[PDB]
């Protein structure tokens, strides 16, 4: 993915005001509830019976930070995403076997948490900048399939 400067600016600058603890937890929480077949993968997180139980679940709310932290790592080495996720490819492909569609779903959702959080500051071109990043990150996980 040939990156633009304004895109890197847009990504790094909006990444600035991101509180990964919340965003990450909310992002996962939304993945868990909107696409509830994703909860299958977090049977080890315990209580996910209710939307209410999911959205304060320490493990969700803790894991959520983990995954977003990881997004951050992409924001640093934007030109080197292929390898930032290389290993978490094997994790998600060989061990866990998550269908790559989920990576967009969880990436589409991320775009919404960002949008609710930064309101008009999330302009359509910003949205587009983040759309690529997310799309890039999901290939980078997927990379170890075909």
């Amino acid at each position: 993915v040939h990156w633009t400067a304004e895109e890197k600016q847009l990504i790094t600058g909006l990444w600035g005001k991101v509180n990964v603890a919340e965003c990450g937890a909310e992002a996962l929480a939304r993945l868990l509830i909107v696409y509830p077949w994703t909860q299958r993968f977090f049977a080890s997180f315990g209580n996910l019976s209710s939307a209410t139980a999911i959205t304060g679940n320490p493990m969700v709310r803790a894991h959520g930070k983990k995954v977003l932290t990881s997004f951050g790592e992409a924001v640093k080495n934007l030109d080197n995403i292929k390898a930032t996720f290389a290993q978490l490819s094997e994790l998600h492909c060989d061990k866990l076997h998550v269908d790559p569609e989920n990576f967009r779903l969880l990436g589409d959702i991320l775009i919404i948490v960002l949008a609710a959080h930064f309101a008009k500051d999330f302009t359509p071109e910003c949205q587009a900048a983040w759309q690529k990043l997310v799309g890039a990150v999901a290939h980078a996980l997927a990379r170890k399939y075909h």
Binding site: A29, A116, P124, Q127, Q131
Partner: protein
């Protein structure tokens, strides 16, 4: 399909949207042509410039149609009959473009109504816009 509580949610936002649905209609459309420029192909006849009255006009019509579907929410199919044919027989819009459109509307309602867009409502409005998407493509399947 839609739950009786789904509909509570679906309708709620659309009121909390209200007449504002002219501007949201455009904002979503523009967000589609920016975040997904391969969508521009379908409107070669349009000036796809920011603010361009074409995308603004087309905007109203789009939301207005959603407005109308979430009112006849027990019968979305018949509420969007005339559009189902246009979007499949003349236009042949790829099913996947509908995913994108809905996505940008959710982004739009999030930016403007984040303290309404709770996961439960996130779900409902997806499920709505999934079945809005489905009936517009009924001539495929």
């Amino acid at each position: 399909v839609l739950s009786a509580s789904d509909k509570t949610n679906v309708k709620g936002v659309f009121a909390k949207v209200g007449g504002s649905a002219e501007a949201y209609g455009a904002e979503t459309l523009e967000r589609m042509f920016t975040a997904y420029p391969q969508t521009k192909t379908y409107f070669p006849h349009f000036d796809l410039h920011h603010g361009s009255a074409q995308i603004k006009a087309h905007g109203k019509k789009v939301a207005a149609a959603l407005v109308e579907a979430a009112n006849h929410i027990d019968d979305i199919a018949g509420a969007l009959s005339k559009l189902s044919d246009l979007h499949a027989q003349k236009l042949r819009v790829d099913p996947v473009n509908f995913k994108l459109l809905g996505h940008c509307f959710l982004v739009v309602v999030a930016i403007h109504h984040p303290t309404l867009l709770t996961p439960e409502v996130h779900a409902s409005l997806d499920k709505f816009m999934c079945a809005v998407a489905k009936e517009l493509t009924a001539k495929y399947r």
